[PDB]
Amino acid sequence: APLNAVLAAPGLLAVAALTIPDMSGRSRLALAALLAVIWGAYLLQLAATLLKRRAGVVRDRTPKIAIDVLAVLVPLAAFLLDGSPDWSLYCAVWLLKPLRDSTFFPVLGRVLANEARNLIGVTTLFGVVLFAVALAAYVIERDIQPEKFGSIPQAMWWAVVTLSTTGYGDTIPQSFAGRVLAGAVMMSGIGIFGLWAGILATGFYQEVRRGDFVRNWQLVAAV
Amino acid sequence: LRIYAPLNAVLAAPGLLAVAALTIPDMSGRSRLALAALLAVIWGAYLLQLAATLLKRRAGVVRDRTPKIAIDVLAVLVPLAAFLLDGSPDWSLYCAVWLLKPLRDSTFFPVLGRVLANEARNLIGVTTLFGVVLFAVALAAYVIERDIQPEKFGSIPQAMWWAVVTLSTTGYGDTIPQSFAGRVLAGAVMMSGIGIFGLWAGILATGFYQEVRRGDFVRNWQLVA
Amino acid sequence: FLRIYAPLNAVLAAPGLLAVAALTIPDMSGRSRLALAALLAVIWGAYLLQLAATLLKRRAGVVRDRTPKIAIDVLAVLVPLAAFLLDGSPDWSLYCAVWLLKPLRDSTFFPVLGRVLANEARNLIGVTTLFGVVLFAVALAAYVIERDIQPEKFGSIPQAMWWAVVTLSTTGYGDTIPQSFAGRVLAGAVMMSGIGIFGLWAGILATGFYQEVRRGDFVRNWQLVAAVPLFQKL
Amino acid sequence: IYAPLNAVLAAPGLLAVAALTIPDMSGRSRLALAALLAVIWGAYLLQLAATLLKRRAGVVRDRTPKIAIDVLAVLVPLAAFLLDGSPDWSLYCAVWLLKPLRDSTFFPVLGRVLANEARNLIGVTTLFGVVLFAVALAAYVIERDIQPEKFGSIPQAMWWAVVTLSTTGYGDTIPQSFAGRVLAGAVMMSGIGIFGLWAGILATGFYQEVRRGDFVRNWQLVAAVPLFQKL
Ligand SMILES: [K+]
Ligand SMILES: [K+]
Ligand SMILES: [K+]
Ligand SMILES: [K+]
Ligand SMILES: [K+]
């Protein structure tokens, strides 16, 4: 079923493989050629999408066209303009190709729209708490660790890395007061970590029960 | 899309970043002034916003907005207090009273308040559930490796650190069990980390489901009678 | 909110547990250390007073069910006393930790949670066994790949199972890290299936707490809205 | 409950596979674990007979994989005991990982969840695959010059991309530059959303199964009429 998506797979990997140092000159050329063949295939797929007028009935596909155009113009612009061996990174527009044919995204679009209001209200909440924490983390250990928690942005780095529970461990609080704070930061992380899921889940629900207005109320109680 | 809708919150964005930029060591005195100026311009802008809210007492018949005003009031009194009373280069930190500014004009926290009140009983119980599991794990973490790592697991509050770290799955990697039985425990602790991440998610999912259930008195009881 | 108006017996537990922590700190002054030991005995006295409070008045009405409540109150005085007598080393106060069950008493969360971890238990213990399988199955591949590269981090299944939990749970300490190419590719798949297994737990519980308030409509608009005539007479 | 008798046996069986691979082990106790493996292997051989032999439940019932698991539990371990000559044969007995899967009454229901929502799930995989590569691209661009060995290639940047976006956060490949660390800030945030995406999708996955089993206690038992429904 997915014709466009399969072609991107070795294409994206070809962009990766071209960036590796100490690669042989003969094999490096082959990876460049594999980029070209797929480009032509995407050029051909542009022609099938563009040249199908006076033969196509009413079908909404405004974003579908955009992907097919970008997939051929960008890798062409770098093909002509960028003379440095760092031209292949432009081919990373083919990431839009697996986003074309999957019924996942037009549904996702109605989730991030019905619950859009609530979602951005969490992001700014994430920022506020992150900042509020990065502030106190600075006041507590600006003296003891002078190059780690030196500035608010140097504490913000830790505020991100603790609230997100990524947890690198390049900037850890040393003071008692600074550690017990980190505790609360590590906890308030979990709280919003699931709050995403909570909101995101309820969005999907109503779309499943919107089609239940014509499958349980007018397809078993009207016929 | 949202350039003239969150008018009050746009101003806070450069403001908070200015507070941040001011504390950076090795900053030139000329640029350090510019940032100090930028704070004041925004402070005056909120003073202008305070007047537009306070002097205009036009409501109509019935209108309640006491929490809305309380934010604007704090956004001018506190920075001014730091401008006068505090005499160290560490006065700018007080401007972070504008963290309350984005919380004003957004229809989400009156909704969140009703989620956090109708499932309060359940939420509160997860936190004391967390604290118990944390303390019990640290207790066990102590007894095992107090005699192997005396400066990492030497006390309960030294293990409580590893508990918070491991349970939340933040996992810093400064305190790590070395002995067999210590690590086996770490496993159950890390796994029990996943448990709590679920209950936090599941309950909030149940609370937000209860918000869609408010429309069963105007769409399934008055339109299906 | 049941925090500053309702749970009286759980408030007492707060300083109690912290005193257990405080008493274990090395380099502590024997003057303040005695004061901490003193605080425990005030609380243990308050719990002993609470024991009689729920043992004097044994009934209020006709028949009331409170078997688990007393089981907590009893353990709250017997175990701490057992350590105060039988154990005569500096390591005794640890037994005061049996006050961790005291917040689990005066809460409405746990009888709710109970019916959730029973109506869906079948699926929940199915996730743990899915975790076990994926944890070991991956750990097996880890040892095979990097036993000839880092023979002290990936030289035994137990060393690999360590990396298995550490990664799959998205803890990720950072002392065991795959060095080879092949290991890092799989390592990613561990972090990815780590997203599933971290969300599958969220899945069951989004159904559990849901399937509880949806049991008030089983006799309000289902078994009492549509019925046949002459159903209950004799 | 003493009902999963087939799974209890698996527990020490698999642990023995582990214990065998530990270096600095005495030959006396190394033989002892190899012995324990045989004991359980024979128990599954007895169980294999108890599956293929006795028959008394149904007309012609479908349980092909339930037998197939017991098939692999005895053909594979015996192949290692014979065909493999190195002390590294026990690794094959790991096939007993399939044993706790036989009758767990969680995996037949999970299959339908990963079918009625599979369309969506395989959507998030290539969504992850996109952002992962999208981020790695930028990481390389931002710090290929500064850290030429941690971010000296797209593969090396991809290593950070999984590590950050899965919130794992090892702490080996870390962006040092301002921009990369600002990016890392988002790469940590958008990972949390993905940690909700699956968690939200599977929150619907288990939903539209518990309300389909109550299509026989609220749709086919509440709305009942004799001689009024046929096809
Ligand atoms: K970590
Ligand atoms: K780390
Ligand atoms: K995590
Ligand atoms: K982590
Ligand atoms: K580290």
- CB under 5 Å of ion ligand 1: residues: A 167; B 171; C 172; D 169
How far is B161 from B153, CA to CA, in rounded Å? Answer: 9
Contacts of B171 in chain D (CB under 8 A): 169
Helix, strand, coil percentages in chain C from 3-state DSSP, rounded to 5: 65, 0, 35
Run of H or E residues at D10: helix D10-21
Name every residue whose Cβ is closer than 8 Å to that of residue D204 and which is 6 or more positions away in sequence. A201, A204, A205, A208, D117
Report the residue of chain C nearest D18, measured CA to CA.
Answer: C157
Judged by its nearest atom, the ligand closest to the C-alpha of residue D195 is: 3
Could you say which DSSP state residue D168 is in?
A: -
Q: How far is D21 from chain C (nearest CA, A)?
A: 5
Q: How far is D58 from chain C (nearest CA, A)?
A: 25
Residues B52 and B82 in one domain: yes
Contacts of B131 in chain C (CB under 8 A): 103
Residues D98 and D156 in one domain: no
> Which amino acid is residue D218, in one-letter code?
N
From residue D129, how far is each of A9, B135, D186 by CA, in Å? 10, 39, 16
From residue C81, how far is each of B40, C17, C37, C41 by CA, in Å? 63, 16, 13, 10
Say yes or no for a CB contact (<8 Å) between C206 and A194.
no
Q: Burial-class residue D184 by CB neighbours within 10 Å (0-12, 13-18, 19+).
A: buried
Judged by its nearest atom, the ligand closest to the C-alpha of residue C198 is: 3
Residue B222's Cβ-side half-sphere holds a number of Cα atoms within 13 Å equal to 6
- Count of CB atoms within 10 A of residue A143's CB? 9
Q: Does D196 touch chain A (CB under 8 A)?
A: yes
Judged by its nearest atom, the ligand closest to the C-alpha of residue C175 is: 5
Query: What are the phi and psi torsion angles at D223 (to 5°)?
Result: -95, 80
How far is A214 from A211, CA to CA, in rounded Å? Answer: 6
> Which amino acid is residue B66, in one-letter code?
T
Across the interface, of B169, B173, B201, the residue whose CB is closest to D199 is B201
How far is D168 from C220, CA to CA, in rounded Å? Answer: 48
Contacts of A108 in chain D (CB under 8 A): 123
How many residues would you count in chain A?
Answer: 223
User: With left for phi above 0 and alpha for psi between -120 and 50, is residue A169 left, alpha or beta?
Assistant: left
With tokens 């530990």, the residue in question is: D22
Sign of the alpha-carbon torsion through C220, C221, C223, C228: positive
Please name the method used to determine this structure. X-ray
- Count of CB atoms within 10 A of residue B80's CB? 12
B2's tokens: 């949202």
How far is A196 from C5, CA to CA, in rounded Å? Answer: 31
Residues D98 and D137 in one domain: no
Query: What are the phi and psi torsion angles at D123 (to 5°)?
Result: -75, -40
How many residues would you count in chain D?
Answer: 231
- Count of CB atoms within 10 A of residue C136's CB? 20
Could you say which DSSP state residue D145 is in?
A: T
B12-23 helix and A152-163 helix, angle to the nearest 10 degrees: 110
Helix, strand, coil percentages in chain D from 3-state DSSP, rounded to 5: 65, 0, 35
Q: How far is D146 from chain A (nearest CA, A)?
A: 16
How far is C135 from B191, CA to CA, in rounded Å? Answer: 11
How far is C62 from C68, CA to CA, in rounded Å? Answer: 19
Across the interface, of A15, A103, A196, the residue whose CB is closest to D195 is A196
Distance in Å, CA B116 to ligand 2 centroid: 33
Helices (H) and strands (E) in chain A, counts: 7, 0
* Stretch 112-151 of chain A: residues touching chain B, C-beta under 8 Å: 117-118, 120-122, 124-125, 127-128, 131-132, 134-135, 138-139, 142, 150-151
How far is D129 from A13, CA to CA, in rounded Å? Answer: 12
Residue A116's Cβ-side half-sphere holds a number of Cα atoms within 13 Å equal to 8
Say yes or no for a CB contact (<8 Å) between C97 and B202.
no
> Which chains contact A through at least 3 pairs of Cβ atoms less than 8 Å apart?
B, C, D
Across the interface, of C1, C20, C201, the residue whose CB is closest to B198 is C201
Best residue in C5, C9, C20, C24 to probe B by mutation, most B CBs within 10 Å? C24
How many residues would you count in chain C?
Answer: 234
Residues A108 and A135 in one domain: no
Q: Does B48 touch chain D (CB under 8 A)?
A: no
How far is D58 from C233, CA to CA, in rounded Å? Answer: 43
Query: What are the phi and psi torsion angles at D152 (to 5°)?
Result: -90, 0
Residue D152's domain comprises: 118-231
How far is C225 from C217, CA to CA, in rounded Å? Answer: 10
Nearest to D138 by CA among D102, D182, D198: D182
Name every residue whose Cβ is closer than 8 Å to that of residue B166 and which is 6 or more positions away in sequence. B137, B186, B189, B190, B193, C171
Query: Nearest-5° angle of CA D226, CA D227, CA D230?
Result: 115
User: With left for phi above 0 and alpha for psi between -120 and 50, is residue B63 left, alpha or beta?
Assistant: beta
Name every residue whose Cβ is closer than 8 Å to that of residue C211 and which is 6 or more positions away in sequence. C119, C120, D210
How far is C65 from C68, CA to CA, in rounded Å? Answer: 9
Say yes or no for a CB contact (<8 Å) between D105 and C126.
yes
How far is A74 from A81, CA to CA, in rounded Å? Answer: 10
Say yes or no for a CB contact (<8 Å) between B191 and C10.
no
Q: Residue A200 in contact with residue A111, Cβ under 8 Å?
A: yes
What residue spans of D144-177 are helical by DSSP H? Answer: 154-165
Residues A174 and A95 in one domain: no
Residues D113 and D145 in one domain: no
With tokens 């937000």, the residue in question is: B208
Could you say which DSSP state residue A73 is in?
A: H
Could you say which DSSP state residue B160 is in?
A: H
Residues C125 and C227 in one domain: yes
Residues B17 and B42 in one domain: yes
Nearest to B39 by CA among B60, B18, B21: B18
Query: Nearest-5° angle of CA A18, CA A22, CA A25?
Result: 65
> CATH number, domain at A15?
1.20.120.540
Nearest to C194 by CA among C212, C156, C168, C223: C168
Residues C103 and C133 in one domain: no
Contacts of D203 in chain B (CB under 8 A): 201-202, 205
Resolution in angstrom units = 4.0
Sign of the alpha-carbon torsion through C137, C138, C140, C141: positive
Distance in Å, CA B147 to ligand 5 centroid: 24
Say yes or no for a CB contact (<8 Å) between A162 and B170.
yes
- Count of CB atoms within 10 A of residue C216's CB? 9
Give the end of a domain, one of A61, A94, A115.
A115
- Number of compact structural domains in chain C: 2
Say yes or no for a CB contact (<8 Å) between A169 and C174.
yes
Nearest to C50 by CA among C11, C87, C15: C11
Query: What are the phi and psi torsion angles at A19 (to 5°)?
Result: -90, -10
D124's tokens: 């998030």
Q: Residue B156 in contact with residue B150, Cβ under 8 Å?
A: no
Could you say which DSSP state residue B11 is in?
A: T
Residue B220's Cβ-side half-sphere holds a number of Cα atoms within 13 Å equal to 8
- Count of CB atoms within 10 A of residue A55's CB? 6
How far is C219 from C225, CA to CA, in rounded Å? Answer: 8
- Count of CB atoms within 10 A of residue C202's CB? 31
Name every residue whose Cβ is closer than 8 Å to that of residue D38 and which is 6 or more positions away in sequence. none
Q: How far is D117 from chain B (nearest CA, A)?
A: 18
Report the residue of chain C nearest B140, measured CA to CA.
Answer: C94
Say yes or no for a CB contact (<8 Å) between D188 and A168.
no
Query: Nearest-5° angle of CA B116, CA B120, CA B124?
Result: 120
Residues C140 and C231 in one domain: yes
How far is B212 from B222, CA to CA, in rounded Å? Answer: 16
Q: How far is D196 from chain B (nearest CA, A)?
A: 9
Distance in Å, CA D44 to ligand 5 centroid: 44
Nearest to B159 by CA among C94, C198, C172, C76: C94
With tokens 């036993």, the residue in question is: C147
How far is B212 from B224, CA to CA, in rounded Å? Answer: 17
Residues D52 and D135 in one domain: no
Distance in Å, CA C137 to ligand 4 centroid: 22
Say yes or no for a CB contact (<8 Å) between B23 and A138.
yes
Distance in Å, CA A147 to ligand 4 centroid: 24
Name every residue whose Cβ is closer than 8 Å to that of residue D109 and which is 6 or more positions away in sequence. C123, D209
Across the interface, of D167, D170, D185, the residue whose CB is closest to A165 is D167
D178-205 helix and D107-116 helix, angle to the nearest 10 degrees: 110
Across the interface, of B136, B171, B199, the residue whose CB is closest to C100 is B136
Q: How far is B204 from chain A (nearest CA, A)?
A: 5
Query: What are the phi and psi torsion angles at B70 (to 5°)?
Result: -50, -30
C13-22 helix and B120-145 helix, angle to the nearest 10 degrees: 20
Residues A221 and A148 in one domain: yes
Contacts of B163 in chain C (CB under 8 A): none
Q: How far is B208 from chain C (nearest CA, A)?
A: 11
- Across the B/D interface, how many CB contacts are shorter than 8 Å? 9
Q: Burial-class residue C170 by CB neighbours within 10 Å (0-12, 13-18, 19+).
A: buried
Give the end of a domain, one of A115, A150, A183.
A115
From residue C120, how far is each of A36, A204, C117, D201, D212 by CA, in Å? 54, 22, 6, 18, 16
How far is C153 from C176, CA to CA, in rounded Å? Answer: 6
Give the end of a domain, one of B119, B148, B170.
B119
